[PDB]
């Protein structure tokens, strides 16, 4: 007779789950036509290779492809308490074929697609480098795009997040359904090489100072943080000695992350359109923080590229009220199969713990996995390289130089450790 909360059962608490989708790159021009140079503006005059209703490898995403991905999520049977969405909604077309109003129109379409299909789902977006006109020129003060997305994303974000988003394209937000968890959505496009607006700025839009203060508050309030952004930290795995953002910013951002590794329970990025792992470590090789780069929904590649990705979306599992990452489930669309019969079959690609025989996604568990990759003829690395392209090409091979570049980028996010890895393994 005293109104005490009702105790749950002795059952095991169910894991928490969240979706990650990225790099949708809608091409509204997509349409099948005899002259394959007119199928999609994003092929920039090249002949689409073998186009179908769900797209083509030389094209960005038809609306039907993006719809099939979100329909899959909706009907998947997976419970999820939120979704992260790390940017890049307009297609790859020349700057004069876009405008601020066109960019805002595509972002609106994608946002409203999500809000219409998932009316009760909190979504945490980040801006990508194509989410601005002209592309990559994301500014260090308020702008029409920043104001537009602050209005579009208001259903998901509190007043403070809306205020920082409008001013600089970044925010942090407590997760309604997960007390003790905070999402930090960075604008890492401010650090991206092509951005003229941030040349020679030590702290563009004051995001480093803001990030430092946010993480410090999280540390003292005993919160855990998931970092999300479009462009990742670290090195490109397919090129030699090339940081994904400007070296000065990569070093500075990584030092913040190392200092707050006890608070940061995950980092999630897009932009590369590939499935990649990174493990942030200290100078002595001790693992500190796990990093997950998710592949894109668009399958687009340039004519000069041999390989591309299949469309992908992914799901993370985490410990409730604790937020340690337990697993990752990668789903994909076999685009050639879907196009041939005209019906999509989004399906499981792999479960990380099962594919690699690891216990969970903690930095030490993944560090031990990537150490296996480094062994000669590692079957684990061969599997990883197949998944890097989301199973696009089972016959794709990675020679000695290719593999050194991959493994060095997985394990060494800062310049000193990366260059030392090259010294040892080139
Ligand atoms: C996504 O869905 C696609 C479409 O179904 C799958 O791609 C098909 O995969 C099958 C099997 O891997 C392919 O069938 C085999 O093709 C081999 C030829 O390899 C390539 O080279 C020729 C060049 O002429 C291309 O035309 C061809 O499309 C391939 O890209 C043949 O060697 C095989 O024949 C022999 O082996 C098999 C046993 O393995 C026997 O069944 C045969 O009778 C014969 O003895 C076989 O024909 C098929 O070609 C692929 N189609 C396309 C369009 O690429 C993907 O595998 C799937 N993705 C995933 C991850 O599952
Ligand atoms: C885009 O493709 C057209 C058509 O390509 C042809 O059709 C393919 C299915 C295949 O049979 C190719 O070998 C063909 O080229 C290209 O125009 C045709 O190209 C060849 C050589 O010029 C010739 O057979 C046709 O007369 C050409 N013109 C037409 C109208 O068919 C065109 O060059 C391609 N464009 C680009 C940028 O690659
Ligand atoms: C990180 O925060 C600590 C803790 O300070 C408190 O943390 C939050 C609740 C926030 O709301 C702050 O206002 C609080 O004061 C800071 O530690 C303080 O450091 C100064 C020296 O600069 C010292 O005089 C205070 O006594 C310290 N307070 C405590 C409680 O130890 C620290 O400065 C913050 N770090 C950064 C980089 O800003
Ligand atoms: C997002 O864009 C898609 C594609 O442009 C819209 O679906 C199309 O809507 C127009 C009508 O305005 C038709 O011309 C197309 O045939 C529709 N389908 C496709 C596959 O193109 C969709 O309505 C837009 N959604 C929102 C919320 O704006
Ligand atoms: N996987 C890759 N292999 C080779 N070149 C790439 C690869 N990814 C990107 N590039 C190159 O890096 C630059 C950025 O490419 P984008 O397609 O815009 C990535 P996004 O669409 O996420 O912004 C391009 O010049 C592109 O040619
Ligand atoms: Zn992209
Ligand atoms: Zn990008």
UniProtKB/Swiss-Prot annotation:
Keywords for the protein's UniProt record, in alphabetical order: Disulfide bond, Glycoprotein, Hydrolase, Metal-binding, Secreted, Signal, Zinc
Tissues and organs where the protein is expressed, per its UniProt entry: Detected in blood serum (at protein level).
Record-level GO BP terms: negative regulation of cGAS/STING signaling pathway; nucleoside triphosphate catabolic process
Post-translational modification, as annotated: N-glycosylated.
Disulfide bonds: 40-59, 398-402, 408-421
GO cellular component terms given for this protein: extracellular region; extracellular space
Documented EC number(s): 3.1.4.-, 3.6.1.15
Transmembrane portions of the chain: none
Pfam families: ASMase_C, Metallophos
Annotated phenotype, changing residue 130 to A: Abolishes enzyme activity
Annotated residues for binding of ATP: 92, 129-130, 238
Activation and inhibition: Requires micromolar levels of Zn(2+) for activity. Inhibited by millimolar levels of Zn(2+).
Binding-site residues for Zn(2+) 2, renumbered to this chain: 88, 129, 230, 271
Residues annotated to bind Zn(2+) 1: 23, 25, 88, 273
Family note: Belongs to the acid sphingomyelinase family.
Oligomer and partners: Monomer. Homodimer; homodimerizes following 2',3'-cGAMP-binding.
PANTHER family: ACID SPHINGOMYELINASE-LIKE PHOSPHODIESTERASE 3A, SPHINGOMYELIN PHOSPHODIESTERASE
Stated name of the protein: Cyclic GMP-AMP phosphodiesterase SMPDL3A
Organism: Mus musculus
Phylogenetic lineage: Eukaryota, Metazoa, Chordata, Craniata, Vertebrata
Gene: Smpdl3a
């Amino acid at each position: 007779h005293k109104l005490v909360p009702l105790a749950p059962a002795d059952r095991a608490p169910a894991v928490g789950q969240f979706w990650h989708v990225t790099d949708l790159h809608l091409d509204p021009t997509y349409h099948i036509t005899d002259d394959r140079t007119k199928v999609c503006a994003s092929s920039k005059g090249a002949n689409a290779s073998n186009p179908g209703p769900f797209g083509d490898v030389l094209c960005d995403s038809p609306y039907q492809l993006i719809l099939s991905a979100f329909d899959f999520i909706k009907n998947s049977g997976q419970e999820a308490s939120f979704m992260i969405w790390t940017g890049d909604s307009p297609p790859h077309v020349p700057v004069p074929e876009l405008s601020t109003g066109t960019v805002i129109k595509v972002i609106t379409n994608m946002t409203m697609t999500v809000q219409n299909l998932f009316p009760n789902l909190q979504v945490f977006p980040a801006l990508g480098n194509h989410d601005y006109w002209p592309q990559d020129q994301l500014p260090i003060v308020t702008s029409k795009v920043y104001s537009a997305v602050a209005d579009l994303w208001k259903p998901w974000l509190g007043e403070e997040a809306i205020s920082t988003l409008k001013k600089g394209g970044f925010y942090s937000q407590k997760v309604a359904s997960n007390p003790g968890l905070r999402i930090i959505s960075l604008n890492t496009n401010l650090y991206y090489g092509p951005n003229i607006m941030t040349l020679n700025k030590t702290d563009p839009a004051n995001q480093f100072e803001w990030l430092e203060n946010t993480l410090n508050s999280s540390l003292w309030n005993k919160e855990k943080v998931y970092i999300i952004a479009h462009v990742p930290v670290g090195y490109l795995p397919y090129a030699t000695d090339t940081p994904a953002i400007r070296q000065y910013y990569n070093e500075k951002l990584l030092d913040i992350f190392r200092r707050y590794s006890s608070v940061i329970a995950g980092q999630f990025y897009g932009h590369t359109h590939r499935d990649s792992l990174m493990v942030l470590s200290d100078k002595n090789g001790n693992p500190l923080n796990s990093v997950f780069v998710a592949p894109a929904v668009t399958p687009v590649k340039g004519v000069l590229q041999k390989e591309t990705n299949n469309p992908g979306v992914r799901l993370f599992q985490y410990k409730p009220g604790d937020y340690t990452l337990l697993d990752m489930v990668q789903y994909y669309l076999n685009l050639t199969e879907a196009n041939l019969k005209g019906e999509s079959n989004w399906t499981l690609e792999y479960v990380l713990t099962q594919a690699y025989s690891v216990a969970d996604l903690q930095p030490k568990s993944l560090y031990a996995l990537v150490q296996q990759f480094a062994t000669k003829d590692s079957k684990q690395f061969l599997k990883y390289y197949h998944y890097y392209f989301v199973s696009y090409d089972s016959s794709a091979t990675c020679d000695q130089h290719c593999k050194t570049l991959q493994v060095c980028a997985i394990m060494n996010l800062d310049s000193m450790s990366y260059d030392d890895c090259l010294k040892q393994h080139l």
